[PDB]
Design a binder for this molecule. Sequence first.
Ligand SMILES: O=C(O)c1ccccc1/C=C/c1cccs1
Length: 121
Amino acid sequence: VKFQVGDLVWSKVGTYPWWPCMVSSDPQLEVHTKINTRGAREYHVQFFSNQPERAWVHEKRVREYKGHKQYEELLAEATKIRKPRPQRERAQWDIGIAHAEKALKMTREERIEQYTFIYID
Ligand SMILES: O=C(O)c1ccccc1/C=C/c1cccs1
């Protein structure tokens, strides 16, 4: 268990680029971490994204969020060629990054209070 509730992380899911997140407890499972059906560790995260999104993410697809400029180092893990991404996706990623930068300046307690999602039945 490398991450705790309120920790800022980058998550790599589906076809999306490394995305700013906050580790949180799953509302149903009441844990922020678990071992999956394949025996691998996963963390529950909330994305700093337009549609309120949460996901169980494989530990290998999660990295500590040290700052927005860390993005180049994440790409370097795969390693002049650059991959494009839609402008609309970049715009939503920039808003999420802006939220993550504000969250990074807070204490873990402040961040949990400010950003944890409200779940409705
Ligand atoms: O909701 C928005 O306007 C928004 C739009 C694009 C990217 C990120 C966000 C915000 C995410 C937040 C998570 C927890 C508290 S705010």
